Amino acid sequence: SLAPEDGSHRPAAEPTPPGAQPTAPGSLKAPDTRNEKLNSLEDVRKGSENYALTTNQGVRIADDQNSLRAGSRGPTLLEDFILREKITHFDHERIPERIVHARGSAAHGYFQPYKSLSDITKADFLSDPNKITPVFVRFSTVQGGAGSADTVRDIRGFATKFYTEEGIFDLVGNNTPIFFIQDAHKFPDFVHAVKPEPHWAIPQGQSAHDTFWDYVSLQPETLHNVMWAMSDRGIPRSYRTMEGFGCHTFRLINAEGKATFVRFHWKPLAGKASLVWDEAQKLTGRDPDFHRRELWEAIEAGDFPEYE
Amino acid sequence: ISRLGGPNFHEIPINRPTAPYHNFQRDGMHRMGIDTNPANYEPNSINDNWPRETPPGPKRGGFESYQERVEGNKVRERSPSFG
Amino acid sequence: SLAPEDGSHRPAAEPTPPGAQPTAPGSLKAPDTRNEKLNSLEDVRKGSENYALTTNQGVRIADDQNSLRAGSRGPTLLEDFILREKITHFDHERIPERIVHARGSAAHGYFQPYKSLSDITKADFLSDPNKITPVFVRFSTVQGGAGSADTVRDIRGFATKFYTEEGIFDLVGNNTPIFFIQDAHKFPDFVHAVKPEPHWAIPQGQSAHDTFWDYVSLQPETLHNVMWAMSDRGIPRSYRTMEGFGCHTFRLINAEGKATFVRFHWKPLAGKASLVWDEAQKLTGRDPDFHRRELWEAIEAGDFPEYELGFQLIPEEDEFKFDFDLLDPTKLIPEELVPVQRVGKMVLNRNPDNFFAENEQAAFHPGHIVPGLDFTNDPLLQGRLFSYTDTQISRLGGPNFHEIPINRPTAPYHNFQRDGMHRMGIDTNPANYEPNSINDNWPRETPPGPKRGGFESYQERVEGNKVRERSPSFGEYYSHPRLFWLSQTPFEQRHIVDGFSFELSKVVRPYIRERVVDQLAHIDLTLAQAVAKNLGIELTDDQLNITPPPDVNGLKKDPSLSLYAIPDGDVKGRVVAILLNDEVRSADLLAILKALKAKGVHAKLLYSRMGEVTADDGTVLPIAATFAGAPSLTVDAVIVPAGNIADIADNGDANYYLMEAYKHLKPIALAGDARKFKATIKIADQGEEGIVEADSADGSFMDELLTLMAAHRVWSRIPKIDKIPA
Amino acid sequence: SLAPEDGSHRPAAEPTPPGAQPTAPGSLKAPDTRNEKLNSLEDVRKGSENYALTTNQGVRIADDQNSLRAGSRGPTLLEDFILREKITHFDHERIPERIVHARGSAAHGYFQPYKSLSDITKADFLSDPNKITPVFVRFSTVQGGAGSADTVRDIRGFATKFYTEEGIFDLVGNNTPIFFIQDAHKFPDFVHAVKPEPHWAIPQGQSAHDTFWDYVSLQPETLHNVMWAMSDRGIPRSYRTMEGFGCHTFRLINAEGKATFVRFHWKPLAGKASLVWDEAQKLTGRDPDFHRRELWEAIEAGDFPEYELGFQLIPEEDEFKFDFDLLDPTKLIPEELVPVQRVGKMVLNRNPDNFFAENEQAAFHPGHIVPGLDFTNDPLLQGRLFSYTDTQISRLGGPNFHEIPINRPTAPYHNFQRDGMHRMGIDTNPANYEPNSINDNWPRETPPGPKRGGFESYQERVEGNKVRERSPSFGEYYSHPRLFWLSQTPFEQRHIVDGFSFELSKVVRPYIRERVVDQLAHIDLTLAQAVAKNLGIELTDDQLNITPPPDVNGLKKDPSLSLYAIPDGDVKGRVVAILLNDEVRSADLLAILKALKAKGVHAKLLYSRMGEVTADDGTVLPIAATFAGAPSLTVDAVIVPAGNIADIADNGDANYYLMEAYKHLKPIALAGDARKFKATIKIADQGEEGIVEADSADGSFMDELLTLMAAHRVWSRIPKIDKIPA
Ligand code: HDE
Numbered sequence A: 001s002l003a004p005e006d007g008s009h010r011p012a013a014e015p016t017p018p019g020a021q022p023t024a025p026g027s028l029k030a031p032d033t034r035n036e037k038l039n040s041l042e043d044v045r046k047g048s049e050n051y052a053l054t055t056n057q058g059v060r061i062a063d064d065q066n067s068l069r070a071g072s073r074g075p076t077l078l079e080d081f082i083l084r085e086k087i088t089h090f091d092h093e094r095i096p097e098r099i100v101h102a103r104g105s106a107a108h109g110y111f112q113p114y115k116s117l118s119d120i121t122k123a124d125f126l127s128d129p130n131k132i133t134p135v136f137v138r139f140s141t142v143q144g145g146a147g148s149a150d151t152v153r154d155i156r157g158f159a160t161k162f163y164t165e166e167g168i169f170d171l172v173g174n175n176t177p178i179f180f181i182q183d184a185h186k187f188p189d190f191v192h193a194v195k196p197e198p199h200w201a202i203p204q205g206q207s208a209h210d211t212f213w214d215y216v217s218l219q220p221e222t223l224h225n226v227m228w229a230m231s232d233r234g235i236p237r238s239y240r241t242m243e244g245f246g247c248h249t250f251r252l253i254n255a256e257g258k259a260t261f262v263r264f265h266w267k268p269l270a271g272k273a274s275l276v277w278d279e280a281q282k283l284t285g286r287d288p289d290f291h292r293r294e295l296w297e298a299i300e301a302g303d304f305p306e307y308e
Numbered sequence B: 001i002s003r004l005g006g007p008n009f010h011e012i013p014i015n016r017p018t019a020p021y022h023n024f025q026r027d028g029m030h031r032m033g034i035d036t037n038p039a040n041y042e043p044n045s046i047n048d049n050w051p052r053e054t055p056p057g058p059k060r061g062g063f064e065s066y067q068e069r070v071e072g073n074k075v076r077e078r079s080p081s082f083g
Numbered sequence C, D: 001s002l003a004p005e006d007g008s009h010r011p012a013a014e015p016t017p018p019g020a021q022p023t024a025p026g027s028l029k030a031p032d033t034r035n036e037k038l039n040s041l042e043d044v045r046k047g048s049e050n051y052a053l054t055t056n057q058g059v060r061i062a063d064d065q066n067s068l069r070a071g072s073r074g075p076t077l078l079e080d081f082i083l084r085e086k087i088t089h090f091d092h093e094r095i096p097e098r099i100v101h102a103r104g105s106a107a108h109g110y111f112q113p114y115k116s117l118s119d120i121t122k123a124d125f126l127s128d129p130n131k132i133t134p135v136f137v138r139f140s141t142v143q144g145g146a147g148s149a150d151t152v153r154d155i156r157g158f159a160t161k162f163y164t165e166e167g168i169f170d171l172v173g174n175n176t177p178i179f180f181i182q183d184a185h186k187f188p189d190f191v192h193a194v195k196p197e198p199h200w201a202i203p204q205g206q207s208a209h210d211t212f213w214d215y216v217s218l219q220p221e222t223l224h225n226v227m228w229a230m231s232d233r234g235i236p237r238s239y240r241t242m243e244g245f246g247c248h249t250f251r252l253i254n255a256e257g258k259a260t261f262v263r264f265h266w267k268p269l270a271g272k273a274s275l276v277w278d279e280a281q282k283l284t285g286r287d288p289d290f291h292r293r294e295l296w297e298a299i300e301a302g303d304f305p306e307y308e309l310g311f312q313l314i315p316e317e318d319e320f321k322f323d324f325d326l327l328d329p330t331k332l333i334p335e336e337l338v339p340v341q342r343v344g345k346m347v348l349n350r351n352p353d354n355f356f357a358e359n360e361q362a363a364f365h366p367g368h369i370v371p372g373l374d375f376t377n378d379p380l381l382q383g384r385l386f387s388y389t390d391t392q393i394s395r396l397g398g399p400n401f402h403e404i405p406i407n408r409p410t411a412p413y414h415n416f417q418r419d420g421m422h423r424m425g426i427d428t429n430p431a432n433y434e435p436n437s438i439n440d441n442w443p444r445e446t447p448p449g450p451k452r453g454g455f456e457s458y459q460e461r462v463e464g465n466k467v468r469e470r471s472p473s474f475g476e477y478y479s480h481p482r483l484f485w486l487s488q489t490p491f492e493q494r495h496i497v498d499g500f501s502f503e504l505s506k507v508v509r510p511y512i513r514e515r516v517v518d519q520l521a522h523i524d525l526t527l528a529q530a531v532a533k534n535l536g537i538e539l540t541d542d543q544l545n546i547t548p549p550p551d552v553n554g555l556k557k558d559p560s561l562s563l564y565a566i567p568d569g570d571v572k573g574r575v576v577a578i579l580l581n582d583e584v585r586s587a588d589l590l591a592i593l594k595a596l597k598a599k600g601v602h603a604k605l606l607y608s609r610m611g612e613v614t615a616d617d618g619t620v621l622p623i624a625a626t627f628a629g630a631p632s633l634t635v636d637a638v639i640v641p642a643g644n645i646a647d648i649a650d651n652g653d654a655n656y657y658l659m660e661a662y663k664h665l666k667p668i669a670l671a672g673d674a675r676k677f678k679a680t681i682k683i684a685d686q687g688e689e690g691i692v693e694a695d696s697a698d699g700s701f702m703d704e705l706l707t708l709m710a711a712h713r714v715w716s717r718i719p720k721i722d723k724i725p726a
């Protein structure tokens, strides 16, 4: 047995402050935190303790340390299906990352209303303060790849999947109340201009390059969200300490068919806080995973992210 | 990998084993199984090395190839016995 | 017209030093550079000037600023095909990144051999010193994603695609001579252990976490490559200043059919040079693209990366003449035992035009060999052969990945394979099988022979049972790590100790740190005690009494394993920060730039703001960057000319610049009143080795600075740095 | 393993009639046939003769007969990269088939207009009678998979890709002038209803099953295109002998900005002709590739498929002037109300080289329009515009499908779109966005204008609330089916009754049959009673009293809706079977072949075995096929020359050949003693219209046969065939 005698390999399944225990998968860290969605995922969760190592076809492996070869210094044989399945799976692990918002960090939770909104909307999840709706929320940057750094200067995404009794509702927001451009047809122009430039694929996670500012200078509609990104809004301290916005006027429709225009907001109950630029930039080098880590550890400690 | 879209084709319902299956493979397009193991490699101490290799034996043992003797040079050659 | 009237939007199409012009696509920056492969890509190159904007179907677009709507405040209509094409292409831009080595930077160049090697190999590209073979080379890290940072601690890949007249040969190497594991079946284990951990996907670009060190502690075969990774080898200054190795014993096969065992080497003609850890880490933050930028800017300036291909050659009858197995890819072959024979020179002289199309989509694979080369039974190589073809079916969308332009051979290719996604080639052969009569059996097999022959494997004898078994000859794990350690200088040894210590400090489970310290005690007690001390760990009496492993074939060191034991410095293409003031002494600046120019050393003029300042004698000096904008991390030395020093003497950023450079062991030169900055870095009045100082910036001032730069860093400074708060 | 010494493996590169030479790739059969598009594919055409067999990486292969193994009876080695590349490419050859129209056959050719149409459209390809536009045309069935049969009962697709100078225009039509449904939201419902049922995946290539008739019975809007499908239109003789239609009202826009509504027509210059059901169904088993093969052979013979493009034009102010909605795709515009104006001619004159690369991977889409054309709000066309771009992302692997060679425009294309899987084009533009200054904003938008302008949509007024609602004007379902029915000849009406009767007999749930017959009673009581009688169903008194729907704008019929009511026969490219005996009268054969040659009608010489037979004068006659090997289904008429008739008089296959041809209404000609076969088909001594007979084959005999063939089939014989046991 490779685990230490004293059991110190396994974090306690209780809330603990950052650094006190190794971090863990959420169902092992907090097994009794439940909601309708987390419980519905039990059909696909797989454990591990006390099970035999197998192929994906259920065949038990005796020696997971060696390829099959003709002699112990011989060539590897094509009939080694155990090797080929394992290396095939490894060879195909990656899927395309998101075109934008590829870097992001996510957690499960729940939402509940303070009162029935039936006078202004027939949305079931807003119909009664007793309606508990599971959520899964992903926070993200915009420009950088999935392996880019967290504390860059950028807009941040704040996307919430509500698993309602009448369907999924996704509220796919950002941390400022507007966007850079007016019409969707120019999205690829704007995003190409902020992304790494196409000859040499530099710079990662930064608007601080000629093509972004060339587009901004030629498209003054961008200047409002550019002001937000150049403020300390663009470098939040934590996903827990920034605002969210649904970006657009949507409609609420009530039972009588009346439409009301609505813009959505998330207000952080931990308050608003941002880094300063020198600290943010240095932090991309000292801990590029700082926001992903701080979110995971906050939830492990019981400092649950809360938004109104 | 092209016909069924990736290396998780064993998770397509009709192809799933009824026997248990557990290992350190992860990810791939269409991944259904949500692995909770703290480890995705072996040998590991952080999950006491589970899931574990199993020696061969008469029943419920691990797979071991029959130790056939191989002897010859590396050749692209049809055996004369096939001619 | 949106371009400025003075044409200052367009980079000069000639060599220019870093920062002088915006960077550009290679065929625009250097239109006159060519090779056979660059010429063959011309059929797919697309221009832009003077063309109308169109759909992908060739329809001109009138308004590329708006969607089609019912009224100018109305809903967008489904019939807007121009919108949907444009967004559909955007929506599908990304392809899967490489499972490992996802972060990398590439350039085009050429290779030529110094003489024909026909007596030892029939490989066409090595048969004639006049035969020039185009190459495409990608350097990479291993662990992080395509969007991760360049100056991480990691191994580096060095992959060369040789477009030979007898097929593509890919030499898929790394910057250390060995790997962490012995058998390919464990590759997913090792890679999963080093990669971000699967619950939370942290950390990016770092081995400093529990699962990596758990694996290492449980698999002592890894300790050799871990020693390399923990040394300054793990943090190269540039891809131009690292070594490359082919990792395994391969074979050369000559026309007579004689096999010789071979390991491949790349010798950087710019010399060997690495960062130090605090600098490399901070630089991941200040410029996570620093190696990609430094490579592209070197080629645009004419500081072309150059490497010498070399071979370690072992006759077949010497297979068992060493203390280690030649097939064990965790063992190196010491150059003291088998010297590297020089083979030829590679020069990288052209950047790509489009990073995604030529870099991201390039596929290298070590199975891509040509007649005159062959494999061996190294059991890590053997499994590599499966992976590099397989993985492209998802990454590049199917089995026609060789039709993607950068991957196309320049040699002829004809066969009976057909169809697959993305099929470009339209085959006119009436047959799609052989043997056939209906096309007189073409294209036809070709017998092996001395040139232009078909591939036949060397007829190696195989004897043994079908086993999943490690050769007992691979079961020695500590001697090569000890040879490496003993070959390092004392300051390289200190930096190894500091790399294990920092990394293990980030392992949350203390027993894993204890298990790794136990392994170190099997290699060298001094190394193990020094790490244990930094971890608050005390060695047991049993640990103190572990017998050191044996020397390797009588060697107790091999200086070719050290980055620095044997000087091989070259200053061409290095860069100096020049800190300006609002009244610079022009004579100082003229002498500094004159001497830097003469050795091909670049400069960046820095100040507290952008714009220009004016020298004492009226000369206008253009500012490249602010102190904060281009930190000392990004340069090789710092020079402060005399002048109005009062202007910058109480500037936090300017003082900090010199403290950071001082801490990172870089040469610093101060002229005249710039000597006032001696107080910020605590230099005595009599001065100290590594700080150049004088009343003015010449006679011997620049020669002294350039001598310090040729030795890369001021290692004698190490004891003085722990006191400086920087 | 080679080619025969006489060279008989290789087809002559000249026009030859069907069966005379093996078929071949187009560039090898007709190397001098060119057009701009064909030439532009030369970058990717790959030959084979005199080239060495290689891996895809350009390495020559020595032994393409064996895997690498350890000993010649040993295990295959993982280092065999030649084997693995070859089997990997084979393992990924297949791509997804088209969701609908998976079965299709295509060819290259060209189009030109008869006169400039600049008064009505500014489209460049319609502007000059001497400006030639290359085309690529794919004809298809709808329901069956890529490996289903050609001569099923189904709708046929007719898709033309025009490679114009102002972009690709795809006219994506079918062989009936309407569709089954009104709104694209129901497309997956209809398609799923006609496709193989989801539990067992039966039936292939057939609407004759419960779910299709369930849907039809519950969606009376489908009845018009059901009438066309149940008619002989559902079983064309050849893709050369069916009409084409664009299905929707589109717009033409001229340089002054005037919109004219237009529906598109293709008129087959070889005339309209279809099979009869028993023949069509049996031919799906004897040659499931009959239409693919007949198209490819017609082009190899020089019988190039020719079609005349035609437009029905309706001024904007006449939009509401008919008793149906112009935007309703279940309604046709009768040619008695709006004539087809001739526009130009399309000739298909070269086959592809590689089916997969050029046919399977071609992508056609009706949203691919050019300036001078535009859409309307037809709610089926509106949804199509979404589907044809979307579907290619899986079928062709990503958004670079326009780079697959057959799909490339010959017009220039330049824009800011980048990346995506298997990106071929290497963009050098420093900018990948607009507006940009760094490339002076190129490529640039182009204002609309009379020629070479940007695309701008016609500014149609939109007034309405956002609704999911069918226009009340679309809620009439029976008048157009009745108009079609009343316009058919009496034999065509019988074949309609027989198609519904045969199909509904295969519906297992009887209430569905009853509900369809109730729909038919709303169209025409004679049709409904005739179908009901075949199904053993009795109409109720209420059914008998249903008032027929109104005439369509006063028409009682329109003969252009019939295949046959107005003669339009052309025998060129048709084929006769000639039944040989072992001593043919050479004077008869001479006369037959000379008269057939003069009219461009081909012959196949058949016998009871293969090899040769010798005529009375010593002429050696090679045999194309046996009586069973090429049944009468595959030919348009049958001739039996005189000679040693006793040789074949009692051959069951020869007799049955005549019985099948007779039952299927084909002309039969018997010379001399072949008149003894009149007894197998019960012809009186006096003779019968449709049976040509004389003492010898001469001028008169051949003229009579050819006149019969110009009328396609012998409809008068229908009452005589009920009793033949064949
Ligand atoms: C026309 C204007 C336009 C267009 C076309 C897009 N975006 Fe997004 N954006 C897309 C396109 C893509 C390509 O579909 C993509 C990329 C991968 C994907 O599946 O969806 C995506 C991701 C995305 C996320 C991450 C959700 C997650 O954690 O996965 C978030 C939080 C936002 N966005 C927020 C957002 C806001 C708040 C107002 C506004 C406005 C916009 N964006 C503008 C916008």
Ligand code: HDE
Residues within 6 Å of the ligand: A091, C098, C099, C100, C101, C104, C138, C139, C140, C157, C158, C159, C172, C173, C174, C179, C183, C184, C185, C187, C245, C246, C247, C248, C362, C363, C364, C380, C381, C383, C384, C387, C388, C389, C391
């Ligand atoms: C069994 C042990 C094993 C296995 C299975 C693999 N690796 Fe790789 N490695 C693969 C598998 C993959 C996953 O196929 C992959 C992922 C994407 C790809 O196309 O191939 C890949 C990339 C790769 C590059 C980047 C080439 C480029 O710039 O595009 C470089 C330089 C190296 N490797 C070098 C290398 C050495 C030097 C000797 C040694 C040893 C090894 N590796 C070990 C090894």
Ligand code: HDE
Residues within 6 Å of the ligand: D098, D099, D100, D101, D104, D138, D139, D140, D157, D158, D159, D172, D173, D174, D179, D183, D184, D185, D187, D245, D246, D247, D248, D362, D363, D364, D380, D381, D383, D384, D387, D388, D389, D391, D392
């Ligand atoms: C809303 C109603 C609707 C919808 C959604 C669709 N269809 Fe199509 N149809 C598609 C969808 C797909 C899925 O995009 C698909 C399948 C694969 C592909 O690349 O495109 C396709 C193929 C197609 C061809 C084959 C072109 C070729 O040879 O490759 C032809 C001739 C037609 N269609 C003709 C057509 C007409 C004549 C007026 C009418 C009406 C309709 N169809 C109806 C229609």
Ligand SMILES: [S]
Residues within 6 Å of the ligand: A177, A178, A179, A246, A247, A248
């Ligand atoms: S937004």
Ligand SMILES: [S]
Residues within 6 Å of the ligand: C177, C178, C179, C246, C247, C248, C329
């Ligand atoms: S290696």
Ligand SMILES: [S]
Residues within 6 Å of the ligand: D177, D178, D179, D246, D247, D248, D329
């Ligand atoms: S249609």
